[PDB]
Structure formats: structure tokens, C-alpha cells
Design a protein around this ligand. Sequence first.
Ligand SMILES: O=C(O)CCc1c[nH]c2ccccc12
Lengths: 99, 99
Amino acid sequence: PQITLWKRPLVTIKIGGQLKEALLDTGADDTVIEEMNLPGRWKPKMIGGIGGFIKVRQYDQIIIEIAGHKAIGTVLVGPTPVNIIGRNLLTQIGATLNF
Amino acid sequence: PQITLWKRPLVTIKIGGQLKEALLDTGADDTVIEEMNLPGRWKPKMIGGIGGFIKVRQYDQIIIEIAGHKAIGTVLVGPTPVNIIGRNLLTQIGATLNF
Ligand SMILES: O=C(O)CCc1c[nH]c2ccccc12
């Protein structure tokens, strides 16, 4: 698809047999989601947006479907107001910013 | 242009007559630029993201050249870690996400 930006670029994501919603975010390096009791070991990490820093849990090798497209990568889990698909997964689905 | 997301989508912008560098951010409703002086009256505003809220001065109807494309719209001046072009101006230059 070609998604204009008049509203938030929200898509359906599936991760661990749970359908959720996420923002296609060109300004996020990493993918940040709410808790979904992800399987596997994790590492603690700090991330920051405008407003300061949050404590997150880093899970690698996570399988996720983004608007139908299958992707695999690092998903950080922490207190994020909205679920965020960062460039790290956006590149996997071939997402580009065009104008 | 078509911009892949293997690195931060940074572009040259011109604002207040100054050339600056800024991030094309589809996850941002608003445009947030580091401390600079701009013409017209501003109003005090608080914007939120990950980590919490910051205080910005809101200027309306600011002319801005994003990667050679003129746009007019609201610009928030504040203590941002990086200059951010939000959807409010991305829509002004016809930017779309594509995959
Ligand atoms: O003092 C300033 O220079 C601006 C203060 C300011 C900007 N946005 C704000 C929001 C709430 C309270 C104060 C502010």
C-alpha cells in the first residue's frame, strides 16, 4: 500500500497469536511494544523519546506479522503509550518514505 | 525522493532562514525544532511521547523548506534531542509510506 499521513499510520500486527495495532514509525530506531509475555530470555535496556527515558526488555528473534508481511527481529517491551514498529522491522517489510 | 530506512531519514530543512538537519518522523503528530527564534507570537504547549512530556513554544503558519519542498504549518520550538518533522508537515509535502 501507499499510506498518506493525515492520520497515524496504524497497522494490525500479530505477535504470539495476539492481534494488536502499531504505528509505522520512521523516527524510531527500534520496535517498542506493550507487554505480551514474550517467550525467551531478554536483556534490560534504556530507550528515550522526547520526554526522557524508559526501562525496556530486549527480545531478539521475535516473529511478527506487520500488515500481512512476515518479519523477524528485536522487539523491545516497555511502558510505551502506543506500539511502535521501528526502522529495524520496517526495513524487513521493504517500507519506504516517498515524496 | 524514495527513502529507504536502513538509516535515520534525515533531510535538510530551511527554517527561520537557517539551514538545519531534521528527522522525517511518521510516528510524530507534530514538528519539534530545537531552540531558535521565529517570527510571530507563540503559545505555551506541552507535547508527550515516550518518557514523558516536554514544554514547547508553538508557532503557527511557519514557512519551512523540507528537502527542497515548501511547507507551511505549526512548528514547536523546544528542548528536543533531534529536530523532527511530524505528520503535520509531512502531509504538506505529500509524503507517503510505501510497502
Ligand atoms: O519560558 C519560555 O520560554 C516558554 C515556557 C513554556 C513553553 N511551553 C510551556 C508550557 C507550559 C509552561 C511553560 C511553557
